[PDB]
Every structure is written in C-alpha cells, then in structure tokens.
Design a protein around this nucleic acid. Structure first.
Ligand SMILES: Nc1ncnc2c1ncn2[C@@H]1O[C@H](COP(=O)(O)OP(=O)(O)O)[C@@H](O)[C@H]1O
Ligand SMILES: [Mg+2]
Ligand SMILES: [Zn+2]
Length: 661
RNA sequence: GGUACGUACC
RNA sequence: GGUACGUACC
C-alpha cells in the first residue's frame, strides 16, 4: 500500500500542495517512491475537481524507464491509471503525440519529449506535472534544460497574455546532490545552487531537517579510508621503456619539453604526429605514432600491472606485421618502419621476462590486494565495486584478479562493467551485457564489479560492503554517489591512489566542495522570498540570453571538386572530393571505378579493414549495401589538400563541404 | 554517425 | 577554445 515515511512526507509536502520544488534525498532514501506518491496524489485531485490530469516522468538513462515501471510506478498506479514506458530503443508503432492522448503517466527518456516539442502536436501545456529524475543535469545545454527553457519562455509569454492564459505544468526535481558547479568559493557554490533552482523554476529547494534522525537511521554512511602509496619501489620497466623512447627520439630528432609517461607528453606527441603528417614527414610521424604507444605503456604501468603495458606494445607490433606483410589474394616496410621493429624485437626478450616478476609491479596493486583481502574475509556474503578510469584498466584489473588464485580461494568472483559508447580504443559492452552483469551481481553469481563511471549513477546496483575508487577522482556529485553505493552493514569507502598523481589532493577539494554545498543549500532555504524571487528571475532571464548567443553562433560549405585526399603516412594521391558519397547520411564512401587497385583487405557492417597498398596505413573498412562491397573511409587517416593549405580532420562534419546521397 | 554532460591537461 | 580519457542520449 502506497505510504511515505515521515522524512519522505516532510520533503514531499509542498509538491502535494502544487508548488514547484527540488527534492534532495540521499541514495537509498526512496526518491522514486516519493515521485509515485506525488503523481497519484496529483492525479487523484484532478479526478475529484473534474479536470485533465497528466504526468510525464523524465529520466537520463534508458534502463531507468524499465526500472521505474517495475519497482515503483506500475504496482501503485496500473489498476487506477494508464501507465507506459518509452525509449528510442523500444520500436513503438505509435507516434508520441498519440501516446500522450492515450496515457496518464508517461515514463521516458528526456530526448523523446524534445523530439516531439521540436518538430496533432505536443506542448508542455498538455502535461499538468513534469517530474525530472536526476535533476542536477538541468544545466547548460543538456536535454532537461532545453525542455525547461521552453517552459520558462512560455512562462514569460503567459504574462504577455495576462495583459494582452495558456496552462503550465507543475515541476518536480529529484536528485541526491545538486552540486556546486566546480566552484572554489562559497559565493560561486551558492550561485550554482540558485542557477539550477532557476532552471527548474523551483520556488523552494527541499531537504530533510525536522525528521533528520529517521533519515540517518534509514541510510547509514560507510567508514571512509584513504590508502596512499608513495611508490618508492625501483621501477626497471619504466626505466627500460624510457631508454627505448630516448633512442627513438634521437632517430627522428623530436625532443619534448615534458616528462615521459605524462599527459603533457601525450598531447605533445599527438600534435607532433599531426604536424609531421601535414608536412609530408613520414619519418617523424611514424616515430611519433610509436612514441605514443611507448608513452601509453608507462602510464599503463603507473595504474595496472606491467604485463598489460607489454601487451599494449606487443599487440601494436603484431598488428604492424599483419598490415606490412603481403598476404595472398592481394614494399611497405620503410627504413623508419624497419628501425622501430628491430628496436622492439631486440628489447622484447627483456621486457616480457621483466614483466613476469611481481616484486617490480605497481604499489597500488598491493594496496588494492590488501584492501580486497581484508574486506572480503570480513563478512559471510560480501559485495563490492572498484571504480577505475579507463576501460583498459577495468578489463586489465579483471584479468589481474583472475590470474591470481588467492582471490578465487578467499571468495572473490569478479567481472568488469564498462560503457556502451563507441568512441574508445577499448571495445564496448552492449546495454544487454551491462544488464546481465548487474543482475548476476545482485544474484550472487558475480561478487566484485570493476567498473568505470557507468556504475556510479542511476542504475540499481546491489548494496556493497566495499567501494574503492582506484585512482579515479571526478567531481563532488559522483563522490557522493560512489560513497552512496556503500550502504550495507559495516560498509567502507576507499580511495586507493598514488601520492604523486595528485588524486588525494583533488578528493579533498571535492570534500571541501561537498561541505560548501550543504552550507549553500541552508543559505538559499533561509533566504527571504523577495531576495530569492529576484535572483531566480535574473538567472532565468540570462539563461534565455545564453541560448540566443549559442543559437546565433551555431547559425554561422563550398563545392566538392575543390579538394583531394592524401594518405597521412605516405602522401600518395588517392581520391578527389568528387569521388565521395554518403550512405544513410553518416558513413562516407568512395565511388571511383578503379579504387580497388589502391588498397588491400585484412581482418582484425564488416570485420574487414582497408589498408594502403603502398604503405599499409589504415584508411577504414569495407561494408555491404544493396549487395555491393563498398569502401568506408574514416577521415582520421587522410591529409586533405586544398587548391588554395593541407589539414587533417577528426570528423567528416569538420570539412566545409556537403556530399551527395 | 550526430549531440550532451563529466574529468584531467594545454 | 583545443587534446585526450570517461559516460550517456537520439
Ligand atoms: N515509504 C516506504 N515504505 C516502504 N518501502 C520503501 C519506502 N520508500 C522506499 N522504500 C523501498 O526502499 C527502496 C528505495 O530504493 P531507491 O528507489 O533506489 O532509492 P533512491 O532512488 O533514493 O536511490 C525501494 O526498493 C523501496 O521498495
Ligand atoms: Mg530509486
Ligand atoms: Zn599510404
């Protein structure tokens, strides 16, 4: 039966009376249950007053649509009202305009509403209540704020029709922590709180205060630790890679103004690779390309075990053999290419055997081991999460746990959890694969997640006894969310990091920022109504101006026979701009009748690459379309030469040219 | 593919 | 504003 707790009621009270508010409840409090109570109460009143009651619940992830239906929204509203969940994933055969007419409570991803609002029609007047789950994203150019700026534009247009009366929905913001917006001062922290209040049109932000004793007993915070590693072990792997990197730099004559295995080095060598590609300096760019891989190995050794650093290099040269070697069904090896390959093969014997000695592994891995061992022996049936930065680190830590049988002995049974986006070097986990791992984690089949930021917000994950942030420090919101996953009995939160990395210091800034947030919320709540209304109006007014400036900026092509495509590695003439066409208005393809002569095919739409004939540089991959084998060219791999200038682009849209169908 | 947000570094 | 890492939505 649908009932609230006393702290839940306290916070819900103004939204039941018909006021726009933001609800701030910690993780595990039941903010989604408060939403269901407010939606029924809102709709039950509209029945008794003989009026059109309609709710729309907006969420930031597709899994949350399914999730809010099963657990909360259907059980209490299905028999009494028409309820539905939507997303871009679900291929529905009804238009969203019609889905509005037919249903009382619509749970969906926020972009589905905006798609309809943009262009029978949909307007925000059609809904009487709008609930925005995870409402701290109602900011900048996000989907929530684009929905809300229409509401504010209608609010201003409504006062014009008072003087010369279009209806407007109630608004409910739901979140754990609103954030401070990277503010380093209490003034800027308060400014950010008022801005998201102004974005959601909240007449008051709401927190548990009177019944704060009940909330503290309901959700119990973990014990916070900070496991620092000074890293005063000898590192012969780092030293031996540096010697290789130093040898390569003397060959190509490219010297840095920065330390080896650092981020400013990574930026430098990519810029140097891009310069050397533009200026037809094959020697320099190939050395810069290889130097980046040796630079990756150093920073891989800094986070995960050095066997991974070896494999990153070892796989790179394995793929170079595949591309450079002339297979059947078809020299590529330059002096520079032969020099770099010999250099690896010479020092490959040592690096492989040096990597097998765990005395020279990273110290953070020993700290991670110690933290895992003592905490998984602590309880009968434990559960935990290791937050790491990269996808590679997540997979590599999963192998480290598996290739070390004392974790299997003690109780741990691990599995990685990563994103589904396709803009990384590491492969993605699909949304269905993500769903299956979190289910097994809850069931007990899986014991320990090694996740990226995928695991921190929104998704329903089982209560953890331990959550470790293995080197990862993001922002104040994500810190509270990661700490919020630890809510089992005798739970602990931990930050395993190197003192040299500066992550320990950046966490203390987030702790400082989290304190400013609670002070700021208090000050905005205590603020008198006239002072509040003035400030909320000012931010609402300048928020509209902000979009007009970006709209005019975005409002700011030529002719396709102006350009030609050179191979970035070897500078050979390949295509004119007239040869290009687009498929589905996204994937670009070359048409030229005698294009087959200039490339070869290798395995790793299709799993068949396209590489240069003369030099073995990747151009892209093949694809089937209407029973025709067509070559998909990725813009990354080409130097575009103009008639008037030579430049490289990362995306096809960055060109000042439109192409045919 | 497009777009959004987060973080570090310039 | 740029480079990368990360996550997401259509
Ligand atoms: N008033 C209540 N009475 C009984 N159970 C509740 C109440 N509020 C919440 N719950 C339960 O507690 C859980 C809340 O979890 P969740 O919705 O994930 O919280 P949040 O969204 O704040 O993280 C749900 O499983 C729900 O069944
Ligand atoms: Mg919930
Ligand atoms: Zn080439």
């Amino acid at each position: 039966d649908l009932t609230l707790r006393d702290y839940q009621m306290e916070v819900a009270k103004p939204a039941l009376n018909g006021e726009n508010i933001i609800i701030c409840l910690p993780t595990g409090s039941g903010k989604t249950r408060v939403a269901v109570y407010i939606t029924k109460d809102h709709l039950d009143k509209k029945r008794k007053a003989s009026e059109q009651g309609k709710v729309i619940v907006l969420v930031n992830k597709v899994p949350l649509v399914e999730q809010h239906l099963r657990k909360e929204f259907n059980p209490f509203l299905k028999h009494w009202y028409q309820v539905i969940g939507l997303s871009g994933d679900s291929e529905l055969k009804i238009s969203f305009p019609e889905v509005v007419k037919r249903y009382d409570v619509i749970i969906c991803t926020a972009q589905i509403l905006e798609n309809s609002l943009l262009n029978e029609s949909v307007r925000l007047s059609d809904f009487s209540l709008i609930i925005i789950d995870q409402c701290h994203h109602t900011q900048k150019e996000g989907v929530y704020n684009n929905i809300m700026r229409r509401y504010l534009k209608e609010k201003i247009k409504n006062r014009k029709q008072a003087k010369e009366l279009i209806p407007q929905p109630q608004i409910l913001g739901l979140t754990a922590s609103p954030g401070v917006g990277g503010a380093r001062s209490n003034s800027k922290a308060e400014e950010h709180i008022l801005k998201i209040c102004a974005n959601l049109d909240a007449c008051r932000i709401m927190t548990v205060k009177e019944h704060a004793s009940q909330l503290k007993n309901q959700v119990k915070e973990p014990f916070k630790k900070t496991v620092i590693a000074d890293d005063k072990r000898r590192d012969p792997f780092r030293e031996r890679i540096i010697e290789i990197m130093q040898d390569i730099q003397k060959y190509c004559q490219l010297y840095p103004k920065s330390e080896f295995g650092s981020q400013p080095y990574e930026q430098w060598v990519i810029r140097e690779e891009r310069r050397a590609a533009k200026e037809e300096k094959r020697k320099e760019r190939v050395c810069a390309e290889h130097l980046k891989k040796y630079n990756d190995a150093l920073q891989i050794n800094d986070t995960i075990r050095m066997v991974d650093a070896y494999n990153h290099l070892n796989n790179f040269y394995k793929e170079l053999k595949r591309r450079k070697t002339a297979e059947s069904d078809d020299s590529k090896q330059d002096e520079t290419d032969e020099f770099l390959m010999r250099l690896f093969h010479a020092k490959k014997k040592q690096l492989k055997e040096l990597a097998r000695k765990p005395e020279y592994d990273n110290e953070k891995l020993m700290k991670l081991r110690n933290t895992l061992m003592e905490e998984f022996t602590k309880t009968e049936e434990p559960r935990g999460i290791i937050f790491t930065k990269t996808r590679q680190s997540a997979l590599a830590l999963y192998h480290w746990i598996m290739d070390n049988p004392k974790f299997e002995e003690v109780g741990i049974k691990a599995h990685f959890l990563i994103g589904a986006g396709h803009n990384s070097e590491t492969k993605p986990m699909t949304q269905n694969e993500q769903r299956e791992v979190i289910d097994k984690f809850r069931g007990g089949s899986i014991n320990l997640l090694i996740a990226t930021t995928v695991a921190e917000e929104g998704l329903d994950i089982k209560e953890c006894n331990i959550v470790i942030r293995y080197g990862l420090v993001t922002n104040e919101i994500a810190m509270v969310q990661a700490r919020g996953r630890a809510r089992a009995d005798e739970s602990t939160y931990a930050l395993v990091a190197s003192s040299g990395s500066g992550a320990v210091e950046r966490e203390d800034v987030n702790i400082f920022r989290e304190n400013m947030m609670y002070k700021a919320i208090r000050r905005v709540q205590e603020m008198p109504p006239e002072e509040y209304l003035n400030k909320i109006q000012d931010f609402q007014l300048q928020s509209i101006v902000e979009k007009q400036m970006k709209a005019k900026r975005d409002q700011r092509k030529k002719n396709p026979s102006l350009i030609t495509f050179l191979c970035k590695n070897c500078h050979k003439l390949i295509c004119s701009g007239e040869d290009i066409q687009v498929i589905e208005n996204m994937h670009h393809v070359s048409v030229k009748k005698d294009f087959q002569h200039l490339y070869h095919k290798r395995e790793n739409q299709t799993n068949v690459e396209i590489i240069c004939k003369d030099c073995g540089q990747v151009w892209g991959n093949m694809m089937v379309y209407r029973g025709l084998d067509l070559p998909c060219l990725k813009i990354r791999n080409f130097v575009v030469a103009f008639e008037d200038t030579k430049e490289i682009f990362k995306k096809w849209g960055e060109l000042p040219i439109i192409f045919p169908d």
